């Protein structure tokens, strides 16, 4: 059994902080990518951000640029997204995810994902 365990979500007032995060059990995940996708009302999931195997390289979608951070701790197995000045934009499931494929050019599938969790910022 190899899982990718989220913790996490919440209710937020804008302008506010939360952190989210995931640990993975049953083999280390050291050898993966990782990823936050969200999927806000009536759309479809999309990758938000993204990290390299030892967090040398890490990737943003424009609209959280400068206000999320991926950040992973290898020791512990496990990812987190930091999020500030939180937006009603940023309503949406959020769902940890590892283990980076692709079919077709910068199309990333993944192995694994969290069971995903609510985070809604009010206006």
């Known amino acids: 059994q190899v899982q990718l365990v989220e913790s996490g979500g919440g209710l937020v007032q804008a302008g506010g902080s939360l952190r989210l995060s995931c640990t993975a059990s049953?083999?280390?995940?050291?050898?993966?990518?990782m990823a936050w996708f969200r999927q806000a009302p009536g759309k479809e999931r999309d990758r938000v951000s993204a990290?390299?195997?030892?967090?040398?390289?890490?990737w943003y979608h424009d609209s959280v640029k400068g206000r999320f951070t991926i950040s992973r701790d290898n020791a512990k197995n496990t990812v987190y997204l930091q999020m500030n000045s939180l937006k009603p934009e940023d309503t949406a499931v959020y769902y940890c995810?590892?283990?980076?494929?692709?079919?077709?050019?910068?199309?990333?599938?993944?192995?694994?994902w969290g069971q995903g969790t609510q985070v809604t910022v009010s206006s």
């Open positions: 049953g083999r280390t995940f050291s050898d993966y990518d």
């Open positions: 995810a590892a283990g980076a494929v692709t079919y077709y050019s910068a199309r990333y599938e993944y192995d694994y």
């Open positions: 990290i390299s195997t030892k967090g040398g390289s890490t």
